[model samples]
Target: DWVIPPISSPENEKGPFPKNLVQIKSNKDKEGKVFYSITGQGADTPPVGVFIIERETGWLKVTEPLDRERIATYTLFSHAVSSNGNAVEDPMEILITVTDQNDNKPEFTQEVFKGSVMEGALPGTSVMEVTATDADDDVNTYNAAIAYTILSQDPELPDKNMFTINRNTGVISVVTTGLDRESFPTYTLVVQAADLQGEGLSTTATAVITVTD
Candidate 1:
């Protein structure tokens, strides 16, 4: 008698959630079978707040709801056992991959982004572009729309404060005068973005700008 659990359907690509069910198989010979058990990654070593499999039937059930914030993913396997705690023949391997949900709030790749400016550039000149990418679904603005900000700048170099980033295009440009690369060759900026509707579900990406004149 070969008894196995049910197979899970296709899972979401990026999720912090666990699959609905886990599958198991039973292989018994007609001659005689005394003992049966299940063991694997999740069986012996289970993740925190996760579920375990039924030792006898191999059915997996979760005691708690999946939380993407706690753990991102996990891998597990299963094998058959005999009465004497020895391998019946060979252990079978099972794979369980947890996906990531949009549970995690967006984060910045770094605290600051560094770049350079030409010694002399006119106002409205393209200084640089601070780019960012999201890990969530493209269709959903919660993971789509991103905004930028310039937190601080060195007062000694007034041109450092002359930069502005396009809300939609991500292009950074000079809005004021006094652009001197020789005097203030480098620019340090702090950039941040969030979902369109104030949704906390967001991921972080980075971009660096260098000026050549």
Candidate 2:
């Protein structure tokens, strides 16, 4: 089984903000196959917008943009399992250090939003309104337009994809589907409020939405 044995690096400790690098050991056999990956998440249910890990050569690569302020210190871990839960016997101990990068900018939520549907709200009826704000200035219809995406639903209740987001208003609605509280008692979504222009080297925020019958 692969193990990230304790290791050390001089460059792993300090950082400026947006662009820091973490160093780790190469846990590869003579054949040179990548056996594991390192992942980081925010301290307080940190929104998982980005993560970094070493590539096949054990050189750390920024999987996503880094925001030290948004997620100050992150929890790091490594896994050495195959696609089918098979463990590699000869795994090496890998070390990771998160560097800081200052590219990220904060965002805010929208002031107000209006969403509605008929009293007899059907399975796919427009039930509620949602919106958010971004402190970054590069938001617009195409760049910072609030968007909605279904994250997960009760497996016991089928037809999980019943809800949809109106790209323009961030409105969530049930299009033309049937709803059975007994089947899918609730719905979960990941509301993304991003800049439309995709400007600002660093910008991030997220919202979790739950619908109750």
Candidate 3:
């Protein structure tokens, strides 16, 4: 019986050359010379030439960078045989998992996110919501997790921090009560969206908040 653990490696693994992953060994090597080979996706099939095994060494190696967004996992078939072309062991299925990386930046849905709040709007009033899309793996990692922020508010009349944004929901809200349409009709804000819980890659958008009577 053979017990092989699943193999997982980070995507875009840096390599000097053919990166060695795992070695396949046959117990019947004493009988004669053992040869090794791999097939299936990423091996000898479509997306081929990425994984290869040394026939003599029985060592499996990856030859190229992997993208988790494109393909998260690969199922490979490996075989061991004697020099006489006789099967030495049953063919085995190998599961290769490609892990995630923060390779993509968060992108806002619109260049300028528009929203308006009524004059003298109370605090915690929801104005508008913004959204961003990421091209990275989001199910397993926070690479695509985006947080919202109000970078700067133009014409800080009543208060500089009169507006705020929810970090997770991208909802702009009224922080302080000072919304006036007569004096400061419109408030231009630089809204920022940052991936990795507001600690990673980030981008900004414009939010034009207008106060109406």
Candidate 4:
């Protein structure tokens, strides 16, 4: 396509992304067999390597993994060469698009999130909210959904739990109070963000909470 449409590549696993190869063949009637030549940025062109073509067979193949997040689509041209340069076949435009593979793995925006509150934060009081990001489409549309969960909490405050998190929204808050900077200078907690509705792929990060006296 002239637009050089977006091509999505599946995440993880060995693949050509397209799952199939492209064929470049002479469509018009010709008295003699024609050879194939490819151009543009691709496995067959300069700055090259990605999509490759079987010269004899006029078949195109993806040589390696393709990441849609890195590259969305490819545009190139294929020409048919007539025997002994006797005929000229119009150059054909090829547009390739990669499909989403799912499994990008949800990731937190930061290595460790920090939050602060008074030493005596009340239960249900909002402490902080840390969410993750997904590369595939449909985060808000639902296909790219992510959920937050508390894997473990340290200094197991008050009720063996210092906080609560909304699985769907990633809203974190104080659960039982009793926060004392003197008793515990800081709290350490591990959180996990899962993609695909919090059921499929997931990633983890650390959180630190500082209580002010």
Kindly report which residue stretches of model 1 are placed more than 4 angstroms away from their true locations once superposed.
Answer: 1-20, 29-40, 46-51, 65-73, 82-86, 112-120, 128-163, 166-171, 175-191, 195-213
lDDT for position 20 in model 2? 29
Worst lDDT 10-window in candidate 1: 2-11
lDDT of each: 0.53, 0.44, 0.88, 0.73
lDDT of 1 at 184: 57
Q: Please report the candidate that would top lDDT against the real structure.
A: 3
lDDT by residue for model 3 (1-213), tens: 674688998898887768998998888898889999999999999899899999989899999899998888999988998989888888889999999999988999998888888986789889988888888878988999998888898988888988888889888899898788988988899988888989999888898988888
For 1-213, candidate 1 gives per-residue lDDT tens digits of 333333332223334544337545455533344243435434456553355666665566554554433443444445556555665545554444444445435455564455556656677887666556555444523554566555565443664466777765657777777655555555555555665533445443444445457
lDDT of 2 by residue, 1-213 (tens): 544443322222334433324444533345445455655452113554244444343444434444433443445565454434555443343443333432333343543333334423675566665655443223112323334433443342346555676755656787645555544444544444444433323222332333445
lDDT, candidate 3, residue 3? 48
lDDT of 4 by residue, 39-77 (tens): 788655554867766655787667677666666677877
Question: How are the candidates ranked when ordered by TM-score, highest leading?
Answer: 3, 4, 1, 2
Q: Residue 202 error for model 2, in Å?
A: 9.2
Tell me the lDDT of candidate 1: 0.53
Query: Which candidate would rank higher by TM-score, 2 or 3?
Result: 3
Q: Which 10 consecutive positions of candidate 3 have the poorest summed lDDT?
A: 1-10
RMSD, model 4, all Cα superposed?
A: 3.9
**Candidate 3 TM-score over all chains jointly:** 0.88
Cα error, residue 108 of model 3, in Å, equals 2.1
For each candidate in turn, the TM-score is 0.51, 0.35, 0.88, 0.77
Greater lDDT among 1 and 4 belongs to 4
